[PDB]
Structure 1
Amino acid sequence: NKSDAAAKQIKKLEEDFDGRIGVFAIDTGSGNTFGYRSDERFPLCSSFKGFLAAAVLERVQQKKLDINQKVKYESRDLEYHSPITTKYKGSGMTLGDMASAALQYSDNGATNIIMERFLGGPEGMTKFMRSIGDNEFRLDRWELELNTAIPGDKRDTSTPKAVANSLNKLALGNVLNAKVKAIYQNWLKGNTTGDARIRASVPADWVVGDKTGSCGAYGTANDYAVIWPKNRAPLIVSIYTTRKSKDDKHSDKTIAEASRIAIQAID
């Protein structure tokens, strides 16, 4: 019953707005999962930046990097949408502050700088994900070219399942030690771009950490989250969407509703 009904609901929703919805949800308390198109590919957009922040924290933990080291970029021509890096250009930022800016504000300067100097580019980022056992995730391009969201293109994509599994590994599992994992969680809980998506789908009193992404083409947008309900084990939700036409705008309310439906399916 419950799982097929949830499918019928998402199907109608994707048809309502003439596009495609991918979902994967996990209740870590029971192990119960729900998936819809969960093995199909969707553009990552900025959502990868939440994994990039984890790859940084892993380097810190392995002692290859220090969370407080100054990263200077006084001479750099910063990408579009660098709200945070542009204000510290004159003085630099710590690696930690930069990594969290990439996450919480989706800062492209933070992102490109980190990948060029610490993470070995898109192939390095992809390699990081393989190291935690994620085979689907691929980053091929840098900000902002990875945003084209061209129908049929596999570059810069993953699957809802793959993303959920990974976020679980990174946020709730054992890739990061107790201390570094807590930092990562705080970064996620501090995300500023997510209020109309998964967070909109659950009580205001529940604690949520997320990373959104919005390509700004082909109505492509997404969100992933760890949710701590009051007095319950955490949930993991992963919502990815595309639309038919280049000029379609993304739909926050669809994401929110997909999340509403998924959370119930695993209940």
Structure 2
Amino acid sequence: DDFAKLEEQFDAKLGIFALDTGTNRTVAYRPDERFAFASTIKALTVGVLLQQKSIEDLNQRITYTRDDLVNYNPITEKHVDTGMTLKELADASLRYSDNAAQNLILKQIGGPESLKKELRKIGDEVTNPEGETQDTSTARALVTSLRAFALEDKLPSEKRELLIDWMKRNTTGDALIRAGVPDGWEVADKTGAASYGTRNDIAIIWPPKGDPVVLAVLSSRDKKDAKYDDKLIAEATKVVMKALN
């Protein structure tokens, strides 16, 4: 309704699913249409990862070299000298979206097929880490796999804590969902971006009064060197909320 108003306003396509937990209402707008997850997968990569380590294991310092650097390393290039420890890598990857840090977390849980096999294992048959479907997923499946990790029971209580934390203190999205949501309202999020003007944010939002909603906004464009505008995430979000309230 309003959603289409913004896809002509920002010349883009919007993927949207919100679900309100306490009550199950839903806001949906192209929820099953594919969009590349781009870096929002870093949230899910870490949900697996905690499945797989004690919180001591996460202290295991990790040594790497300047060859492991790719195109965005914003924390990780500060260190190839010292080294950084897996918790440190969870943090950088999620709060900063460091790509190198993702790369390493991956190579720990045994990479894209291992992660696949692991997402299939919590009910996710859409998400697709390797008319192209390689590396794309849907507003739907992303909210439902994020909820499994951070709100349901796919993690033990104390790991589930650290995820959130990492996602509350994200630095990468205050122009996006965190912008559509009033002062006083927690969001934990992980943001994405790529060419063809993909810009994504997924998130849990908590409104001082009882149960959280969980929300994915996705978008892209036309046209491969397109650039993206953040305020499309923010208004998309203001509608989802009202929509909801």
Name the TM-score class by shorter chain. Answer: over 0.9
Instruction: Map Cα deviations across residues 60-116 of structure 1 (whole Å, 9 max, x no partner).
Output: 14x8x7011011113534111111111121111111110221111111111112212
| Secondary structure, counterpart of 1:54 in structure 2 | helix
Distance 1:257 1:181, change over 3 A: same
Taking the aligned partners of 2:68 and 2:144, their CA distance within structure 1 comes to 36
Q: Give, in whole Å, the separation in 1 of the partners of 2:14 and 2:48.
A: 28
Deviation string, structure 1 residues 224-264 (Cα, Å, up to 9, x no partner): 01111112311111000011122321121111111111122
Matched, 1:13 2:3: no
- Assess if the C-alpha contact under 8 Å between 1:24 and 1:34 holds in 2: yes
Deviation at 1:134, TM superposition (A): 1.0
State whether structure 2 residue 170 is matched by structure 1 residue 179. no
| Unaligned 5+ runs, structure 2 | none
Q: SS of 1:192's equivalent?
A: coil
Which residue, 207, 210, 218 being the options, matches 1:229?
207
> 2:125 corresponds to which residue?
135
Match of 2:46 among 27, 42, 53: 53
Q: Partner of 2:149 in structure 1?
A: 170
Whether contact under 8 Å (1:53, 1:100) holds in the other structure is: no
User: Which of 22, 38, 43 is equivalent to 1:29?
Assistant: 22
SS at match of 2:17: strand
Q: CA deviation at 1:52?
A: 1.1
Partner Cα separation in structure 2 for residue 135 and residue 67 of structure 1: 28
| Partner secondary structure for residue 221 of structure 1 | strand
Letter of the structure 2 residue corresponding to residue 80 of structure 1: N
Q: Tell me the C-alpha RMSD between the 2 structures.
A: 1.4
SS state at 2:109 partner: coil
User: Does residue 88 of structure 1 match 2:66?
Assistant: no
**Could you tell me which amino acid in structure 2 is paired with residue 192 of structure 1?**
T
Deviates more, 1:15-24 or 1:35-44: 15-24
Q: Taking structure 1 as the reference length, what is the TM-score of the superposition? A: 0.88
Provide the rounded CA distance (Å) in 2 between the counterparts of 1:225 and 1:199.
9
Distance in 1 (CA, whole Å) between partners of 2:67 and 2:12 is 39
The answer as to whether partners of 1:196 and 1:252 remain within 8 angstroms in 2 is yes
Q: Residues 247 and 75 of structure 1: is their aligned pair in 2 closer, same or farther, counting only changes over 3 Å?
A: closer
Q: Give the 5 Å matches for 1:97-108.
A: 97-108=88-99
Q: Which runs of 5+ in 1 are unaligned?
A: 1-7, 141-151
Match of 1:120 among 106, 110, 131: 110
Give the Cα separation in 2 of the matches to 1:224 and 1:240. 8
Asked if 2 retains the 8 angstrom alpha-carbon contact of 1:22 and 1:160, the reply is yes
Between the aligned residues of both structures, percent identity stands at 43
Q: What CA distance in whole angstroms lies between the structure 2 residues aligned with 1:231 and 1:72? A: 44
